[PDB]
């Protein structure tokens, strides 16, 4: 059965409610991006309207074979009426096509559904700017002032160093990158594009990218791994292990591997700067762990609901103990007092 918080009142409207069958009075299903807790439950089989991005529809029709008549994609920073009720889709700075919605209901409250997101002020001058937001429905991953991580743009800069420094002291290391799902395709992007070199991968990972409005993107990746050095594997193969079984592959053509697995938040960040970090060594393989998030860290989360000033707050993340809905709840009314909302 379908959970409160991903219920919009007064609405025939679901957010991210796939797995739950058929919900008693829902009218039209919103996904806000395509990752697989979210998503869980569509399918070819699946005969309702669904409400997302362009981006999220391309990979519902190309990798889970939705049909085309149920997939209701939307523009970004339109006004749109969907069953009688105006929302607006919004960038989320999460992975492609993941968006955040606003509800403009008809007795005049209104409310923003974040999804997954890395708040920024950029959002501080989107649509949001105009009026006022009675519910927040928030991603609240981070939601604890412990969790500190670097701009994704000082990651990278470590990244493109790291990789840029290797291959020139030695032109026989390969570049390898660990994913699991879209997001954080940066990293992979700017290690290639300094190395002069495209990314290859799998056949079906380079059919998920080709569903992401990226451009210029025949021109970055590729299935020929013979012609790449830099290649994508699956995270869980990021260990020596699975590094040297790979390295075998590759017909002697290298000497070395530098794997990257990016994380989210690791404690490491409590103690070690972006620019401090090393690798785990043994033998001609490192691997370095690098906390590039896809989510607010509490800092940015924080700045973020003190400028939007909602009334009310409903976590989406985190909701599972009573220890962390009452830790999310003290940290909500600290920000309320401090601003003064
Ligand atoms: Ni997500």
């Given at each position: 059965?379908?959970?409160?918080?991903?219920?919009?009142?007064?609405?025939?409207?679901?957010?991210?409610?796939?797995?739950?069958?058929?919900?008693?009075?829902?009218?039209?299903?919103?996904?806000?991006?395509?990752?697989?807790?979210?998503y869980?439950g569509?399918s070819?089989?699946?005969?309702?309207?669904?409400?997302?991005?362009?981006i999220?529809?391309?990979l519902?029709?190309?990798?889970?074979?939705?049909?085309?008549?149920?997939?209701?994609p939307?523009?970004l920073?339109?006004?749109?009426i969907?069953?009688?009720?105006?929302?607006v889709?919004?960038?989320?700075?999460?992975?492609?096509?993941?968006?955040?919605?606003?509800?403009?209901?008809?007795?005049?409250?209104?409310?923003?559904?974040?999804?997954?997101?890395?708040?920024?002020?950029?959002?501080?001058?989107?649509?949001?700017?105009?009026?006022?937001?009675?519910?927040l429905?928030?991603?609240?991953?981070?939601c604890?002032?412990?969790?500190?991580?670097?701009?994704?743009q000082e990651?990278?800069?470590?990244?493109?160093?790291?990789a840029?420094?290797?291959?020139?002291?030695?032109?026989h290391?390969?570049?390898?990158?660990?994913?699991?799902?879209?997001?954080?395709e940066?990293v992979?992007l700017?290690?290639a594009?300094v190395?002069?070199?495209?990314?290859?991968?799998?056949?079906?990972?380079?059919?998920?990218?080709?569903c992401?409005?990226?451009?210029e993107?025949n021109?970055?990746?590729?299935?020929?791994?013979?012609?790449?050095?830099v290649?994508?594997l699956?995270?869980?193969?990021?260990?020596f292990?699975?590094?040297?079984?790979?390295?075998?592959?590759?017909?002697?053509?290298?000497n070395?591997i530098?794997?990257?697995?990016?994380?989210?938040?690791?404690?490491?960040?409590?103690?070690?700067?972006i620019?401090?970090?090393?690798?785990?060594?043994?033998?001609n393989?490192?691997?370095?762990?690098?906390?590039?998030s896809?989510?607010?860290?509490?800092?940015?989360?924080?700045?973020?609901?003190?400028?939007?000033?909602?009334?009310?707050?409903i976590?989406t993340?985190?909701?599972?103990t009573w220890k962390?809905?009452?830790?999310m709840?003290?940290?909500?009314?600290?920000?309320?007092?401090?601003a003064?909302?």
């Amino acid at each position: 059965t379908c959970p409160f918080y991903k219920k919009i009142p007064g609405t025939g409207f679901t957010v991210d409610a796939f797995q739950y069958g058929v919900v008693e009075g829902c009218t039209a299903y919103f996904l806000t991006h395509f990752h697989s807790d979210h998503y869980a439950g569509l399918s070819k089989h699946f005969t309702f309207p669904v409400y997302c991005s362009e981006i999220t529809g391309n990979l519902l029709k190309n990798k889970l074979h939705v049909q085309e008549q149920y997939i209701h994609p939307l523009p970004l920073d339109t006004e749109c009426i969907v069953n009688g009720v105006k929302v607006v889709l919004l960038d989320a700075n999460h992975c492609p096509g993941a968006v955040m919605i606003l509800f403009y209901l008809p007795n005049g409250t209104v409310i923003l559904h974040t999804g997954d997101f890395r708040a920024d002020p950029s959002m501080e001058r989107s649509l949001l700017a105009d009026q006022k937001v009675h519910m927040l429905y928030l991603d609240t991953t981070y939601c604890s002032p412990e969790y500190t991580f670097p701009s994704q743009q000082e990651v990278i800069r470590f990244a493109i160093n790291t990789a840029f420094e290797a291959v020139t002291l030695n032109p026989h290391a390969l570049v390898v990158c660990g994913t699991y799902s879209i997001g954080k395709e940066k990293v992979f992007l700017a290690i290639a594009d300094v190395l002069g070199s495209k990314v290859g991968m799998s056949q079906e990972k380079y059919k998920t990218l080709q569903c992401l409005n990226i451009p210029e993107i025949n021109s970055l990746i590729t299935t020929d791994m013979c012609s790449s050095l830099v290649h994508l594997l699956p995270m869980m193969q990021i260990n020596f292990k699975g590094l040297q079984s790979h390295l075998k592959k590759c017909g002697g053509k290298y000497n070395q591997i530098l794997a990257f697995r990016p994380t989210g938040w690791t404690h490491s960040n409590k103690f070690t700067r972006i620019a401090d970090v090393i690798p785990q060594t043994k033998g001609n393989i490192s691997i370095y762990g690098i906390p590039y998030s896809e989510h607010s860290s509490y800092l940015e989360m924080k700045r973020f609901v003190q400028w939007l000033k909602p009334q009310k707050i409903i976590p989406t993340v985190n909701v599972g103990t009573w220890k962390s809905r009452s830790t999310m709840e003290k940290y909500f009314r600290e920000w309320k007092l401090e601003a003064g909302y």
